[PDB]
């Protein structure tokens, strides 16, 4: 599924993300943006091997089990294939385990260099929330 902007920011709020570690809303919607183009499709792989998986591109190497990745862990407890769901439960709920791990939103790369510092409410404005 291609969720729309307001679409989806409204999804991230009803699973809990508004504000999860102190990361506003705008915030893990410019992650997804740039992530994923707000694909839950979205597949890429790594020079390592690993892959990064759905609307947050979350990584085979520590997340999810994919089978293909060795020597990775899975500390979400899902298979990657569950972060490519219409139904973004599975990504968030590993994003939060994620987000908690100790660097905040700098875990995603594409969010500390393209979302971290700019005007990021600019994602959601608009949205009936
Ligand atoms: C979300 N991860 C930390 C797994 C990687 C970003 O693409
Ligand atoms: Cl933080
Ligand atoms: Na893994």
Known sequence: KVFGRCELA??????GL???????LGNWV????????????ATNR????????????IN?????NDGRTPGSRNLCNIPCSALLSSDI???????????????????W??????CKGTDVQAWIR????
């Open 89 to 107: 439960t599975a990504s968030v709920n590993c994003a939060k385990k994620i987000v908690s791990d100790g660097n905040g939103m700098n875990a």
């Open 46 to 57: 790594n020079t390592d091997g690993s892959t990064d998986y759905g609307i947050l591109q």
């Open 60 to 64: 085979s190497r520590w997340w999810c």
């Open 109 to 114: 790369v594409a969010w500390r260099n393209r």
């Open 30 to 41: 410019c992650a997804a943006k740039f992530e994923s183009n707000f694909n839950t499709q």
């Open 18 to 24: 508004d504000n999860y570690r102190g990361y506003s």
């Open 126 to 129: 608009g949205c009936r929330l």
């Open 10 to 15: 409204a999804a991230m709020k009803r699973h």
